[model samples]
Target: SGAIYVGNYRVVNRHLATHNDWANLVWEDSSRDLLVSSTTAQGCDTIARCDCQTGVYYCSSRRKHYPVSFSKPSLIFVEASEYYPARYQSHLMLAVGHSEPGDCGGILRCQHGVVGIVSTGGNGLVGFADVRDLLWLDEE
Candidate 1:
């Protein structure tokens, strides 16, 4: 019988890092790029996208501000996956912030027809709430 080898991967010490300095980063392998959303202690959130192959990051849009109580902000890749298809086309990522109850919020339709609906606390905001459909490029 041939010799066999076994290995174990152990978890090292895990500790929470300070939120003020932590990098909020996410990636879409479909587009071959990464997005980083950094927030200041004053609740200002700045978003930037980086080229996956070049490691160059640049701000694509303006920074957004929310109340300090907001937590677990997420960036959703909506119709970009459907329209872009396999990294050759432009991709869009929408950032959503979960704000405290009664905080002001709004939804927007990006120039590329991606619909993003963000609520303050799951209760829909006036005039900019739900999205029944996202009208992008027609599927062939």
Candidate 2:
């Protein structure tokens, strides 16, 4: 069976204070709806929604700066479930240069776990994207 997942998101800039880093963001449909709760380095908390249609996720936090060493952070939503698995079914891969290296990367999944991080290079900012590749798999 196939299903559509949709919702909002609340993200906490936990890596802001120390490395000023952004955690690699991704979403999984544990059930029908996907919602997440995160804690920040400043000890602040957040919550957010997931969009199954466009893969676009939104958060209500202001951007912060990162330390000199760490790169900026971004999140990629990989579709995972018994219904719509990865194209390979067991493994996932990212296209090189598909995103900004060191600043943002792509998201991959193998069954129930995350495989890689999405970033280009830098810190102090964050970004998001919705993957449409999963839709192709759904059609089959």
Candidate 3:
């Protein structure tokens, strides 16, 4: 092998009430941010790193390229789902948009701070994994 193992992640699960598909990733470098699918990269021990573009890291960890957009959220407020499964209250962040499955783990932000991390996408809507829990875990 030509590379060394560099990092790993810690995951959280809230079952069906939330999309609980986000994890906290830690790398040896620990400075540059990365966003990718937790499932696909689970077993890989090494990644090929590269410089990011001016705005964002559009490419996958293995250097696969994709389109990057700087589009802002269309709505500042969103209503929560009334159903039980995947249901959330007004406290969670929501955006009017569509995201591919591969876009699951990216960060969600606003002028306030890091709002949340991406968790689910459907029906022209997107849900974010709240950062409060993650921040709580980091403090431990």
Candidate 4:
């Protein structure tokens, strides 16, 4: 229906984590089975998935488990820090989330199923996602 960005850090040829996995939290299905998951803030993890419906990785822990909303879904770019302006929530979110109990729950860094790098505000929670071209501002 639209356009997006999908680079090296990817879930497939069409979908990218956009997270860029600057941290170890991202484990692409590239060549490992980290999908088993960890339960500590240090074990935070997630593997990107490409769905047919569009930019929804139903199997990826960030969506299948954790709470993250991305306005984009390709050309993955990673970073943090933001001011909601409306919510009035701002801080160095090294690791912020509402993961369920069990393996999904934990602080982060020593946790699992973490979104890696969320930009600080997607309804109070940072939304880690892929960068959609949507006409990528400046392109060749």
Among all candidates shown, the one with the greatest TM-score: 3
Off by over 4 Å in 3: 1-92, 133-135
lDDT agreement with native, every candidate: 0.22, 0.24, 0.33, 0.24
**Candidate 1 stretches greater than 4 Å from native:** 1-98, 120-140
Indicate the worst ten consecutive residues by lDDT in candidate 1.
Answer: 1-10
Question: What is the C-alpha lDDT profile of model 4 across 13-109, one tens digit per residue?
Answer: 1122233332323333321101111112321124332221112222222445333233332322222323112222221132234321121112111
TM-score of each: 0.19, 0.19, 0.35, 0.20
Model 3 worst lDDT run, 10 consecutive residues: 27-36
Model 1: per-residue Cα lDDT over 33-90, one tens digit each: 2121233333212112211111111111223432221222233222222123222312
Per-residue alpha-carbon lDDT of candidate 3 for residues 1-140, written as tens digits (9 for 90 to 100): 01111233333213221222234333211111122223334332322122221122222223432323333322223333322233333323345555544454554433333334444445665545443333332222
Q: Order the candidates by lDDT, highest first — what do you get? A: 3, 4, 2, 1
| Residue 42 lDDT, candidate 4, scale 0-100 | 29
Judged by whole-model lDDT over C-alpha atoms, candidate 3 comes out at 0.33
Which of candidates 3 and 4 is the stronger one according to lDDT?
Answer: 3
**lDDT: which is higher, 2 or 3?**
3
The candidate 2 region of ten consecutive residues with least summed lDDT is 51-60
